[PDB]
Structure formats: structure tokens, C-alpha cells
Structure prediction request, 454 residues.
Amino acid sequence: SSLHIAMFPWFAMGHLIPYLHLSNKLAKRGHKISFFTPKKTQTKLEQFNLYPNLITFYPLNVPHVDGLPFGAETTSDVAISLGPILMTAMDQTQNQIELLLTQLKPQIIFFDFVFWLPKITQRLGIKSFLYFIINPATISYTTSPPRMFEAENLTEVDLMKPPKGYPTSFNLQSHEAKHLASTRKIEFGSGIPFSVRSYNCLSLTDAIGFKGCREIEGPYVDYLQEQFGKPVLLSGPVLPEQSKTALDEKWGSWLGGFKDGSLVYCALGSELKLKQDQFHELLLGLELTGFPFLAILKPPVGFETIEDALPEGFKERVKEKGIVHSGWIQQQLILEHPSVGCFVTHCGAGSITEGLVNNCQMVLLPQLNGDYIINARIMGRHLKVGVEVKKGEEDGLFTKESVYEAVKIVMDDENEIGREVRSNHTKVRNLLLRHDLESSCLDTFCEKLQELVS
Ligand SMILES: O=c1c(O[C@@H]2OC[C@H](O)[C@H](O)[C@H]2O)c(-c2ccc(O)c(O)c2)oc2cc(O)cc(O)c12
Ligand SMILES: O=c1ccn([C@@H]2O[C@H](COP(=O)(O)OP(=O)(O)O)[C@@H](O)[C@H]2O)c(=O)[nH]1
Prediction:
């Protein structure tokens, strides 16, 4: 029988988009989806609703919290340092969420971050499903019980090694362990420290799920199920669905002028802004390659236009071979264009999937975020599908030569490291796109959801 599922993702495009990709896959199997979205953001999400008779959007009014920019609805509307205030605002939708659940009466609600929800749903007879689109390797490393019981005795050197029982090995740099040790304590909404919030969600929810498949994410889901003693499900890799909007003719024509496989596409997601010096180093490193490039970047910290922050003489030298562009673009459609030979990525989980299912060589430029860093280590060292740009051990900074070097390695047909990462990326793409991989993941996923509501 068909399920009624409500979707309540975090107010971020990197959560909204994969929740909607999965919503379409569930609706294709006959399930009814009630999709909760910030009100103004709904207009930008309609292009991804392939089953409007089964997927209905329900608008949320994102309430004011002191400090929140006016009208802001997602992390693409605020600086990263303002994220905790946007999470207080999500916490404050509780009244309109409880009204929606009593009127719509779903059997299950998928959610991010709001650890007060499982108390409401248990009262209403609804099953709570904490659904992550980040890597279970990340949650396992930072938010498993052994990490939480050290409380404030958890140090940078503690975070240099994995928690007890962790299923794999990789190395963090000093500045990365420092980042994790400090940021985990910082309040993220309504006075709740960041890792405490996610631990509360894991502890109180009825069940847990992640984007991913057994072949890659399996060992981390098994570890988390052992630790938290409740079902931890896999949705499948959430392969991107096709939009109802074709590729903007402006980009289609410009991209079409380049030889197949010759262009370097660089994008660091929709949330972050580089500092000026690393913005300069990144763009000068792309220029040094001599390849055409498209860099989708916000103006660096302190600056309001790309043009004002470009290194001196950059546009005059680069001419028509390179564009640096600040607006939202159709990334998934650009990554499918045959001109693209290389993807320089911040290692967001959504961007990683979009690169893996395409042909582009992967250059890993993780920004300072636990999931980006752990994704970069798994992609660079475990799957070995990409080359990571070297950062200073203590300062976290890269040179333009290190950017140049990584792109040159993967783009050089005669470079054996480049051939190896191409060959490994091909193996991973063939797995993810295998004719029965995603469908059998979803088969299991839906059986376990049916068990959950029985
Ligand atoms: O990047 C992280 C992340 O997602 C990001 O968290 C930070 C910002 O809010 C981003 O928009 C969001 O995508 C989340 C997260 C996502 C969804 C949830 O339901 C949840 O409980 C936690 O946990 C993390 C835990 C870490 O130890 C390290 C991380 O790096 C993240
Ligand atoms: O200009 C942009 C920037 C991002 N994206 C999409 O936004 C999502 C970003 O999610 P990810 O986890 O990669 O990064 P984030 O933006 O959350 O840091 C992916 O689906 C990208 O294809 C897009 O379409 N256009």
C-alpha cells in the first residue's frame, strides 16, 4: 500500500534539492508526498516537481529572529555565520508544523535538525525519520556516542583519530581537527551546541536514514545502527532527476564553442564565500592551466562584485577562455555538457553525486566543513576518484601552484595518476548508474519504511 510521507528539510538548497529528487522517486512508486518548504522558495522548486498530483508543496513562513536578514529563507540568503539564527527560525516554525501534521496526518515525516519533532509526532502517532543527505561517515566521525560522552573534554588531538569502533581509516590535518573541535561547541539555533543538536536528533528519532548505497556508505550505516540501536536506512544514492527547465541558451551556446572535454568547471556550492587571497589563488591557478574555465563563485569576503575582486589584469589576459560568474546556474545540466573535462568541487555531498554520475575528472577543494573534508578524504583516498588540492597543515590555505598542479594532473591524458582516477571514477559511475542499483536500494528502503509504520 502507498504511504503518505511529509518532508521537512533544512532551509538550504543542498537539502531541498535531494529531498525533492527523492520525493520524485517515491511518488513514482505511488507514495503521496507533503513537501514543506519556505514560502518564497517554493517558486524555485516547482521545476523539480515531476509528479504534481502526488507531491504537494506546503509553504512555511520563516519567522523573524533578531539578526536574521529581512525576508531570508535559506542558507543561500545569509552569510554562513548567520546560519545559527536561521536555525532558530526553523525551530520557531513549530506552531505551523504542528498545525500541518494534525491536518495532513502523514504516516512518516522526514526531517533535518529539529530534535523537538519526535515528541510531537509520537503524540500524533506519526513516525519520525531523521533523513541525512550528508555522508554517514561524517555523522559517524563526529556525533557517535563515544564522541558525545567526552563532552567538553573532546580536543583537537581527540578528533585526529576516529571514535572507538569506526570502520575505516583516514587522516585529518591539524587545522581540520581544530575546526571540528571548536565548531562542534558553537550554538546552532536556540542555544543548542551544534553537535548536541544532531545527537539529540539521532537519540530521539524513531529511525534514521541516509542518502547512499551499501557499496559505499554501508560500513558507516552499519556502525551507526550498532551504536544507536535503531534502524539506519539507505535511500539509494539519490541520482539527480531531470528538470522541466532546459539548459539556459546563454550557457549552452558559450559552452558549445569549446572542444569536448577541454573546459574546467569550478563551483563551491551556494552558501560560502572565499576570502580574497584564496579567491585570487584559485582563479590564478585556473588561469595557469591554460584550459578554458567557468568558475561559479560568490565575490570574496569584503567585496560585492566579482569584477572588483579579480586579480589585476585578469579579465584582459583571460579574454574569452574564462568566465567568473556569481549567480545561480543549472549545475547539473552544465556537468552533463560534453565540453566539461574537469570539476573543481568544494565536495558538497550533492555536487559529489553530480560529478560521480558524469564523465568529468574530479579535483577536490573541500572547504572548512566536516562533511566536505570527510567527503574529500573518501573520494581522494578510499574511492580514489579525484585528486585533492594540497592545503597548509596548520593554516588551511592553498597556493595557485597547487590548484594548477591538481588540474594539470587529471587533465593530462598521459599522466598515470590522472588515468587511474579516471578509471576509478568510471568504476564508481558504472556502479551508481547500474540498472538495478538505485531501484533495489529503493525497494529495500520502502520495505523498511513499511515495517516502520506497521
Ligand atoms: O555539514 C554538516 C551538516 O549539514 C550542514 O550543517 C551546517 C549547515 O547548516 C549546512 O547548511 C548543512 O548542510 C550536518 C547536518 C545535516 C542535517 C541534519 O539533519 C543534521 O542534524 C546535521 O551535520 C554535520 C555534522 C558534523 O559533525 C559536521 C558537519 O559538517 C555537518
Ligand atoms: O549555482 C548553483 C549552486 C549549486 N547548485 C546545486 O545546489 C546543490 C548544492 O548542494 P551541495 O551539497 O553540493 O553544496 P552546498 O551548496 O549545499 O554547499 C547541488 O544540487 C548543486 O547542483 C546549483 O544548481 N547551482
Summary: The CA atoms of residues 313 and 319 lie 10 Å apart. The chain has two domains: 4-239+435-453, 249-432. The longest helix spans residues 416-432.
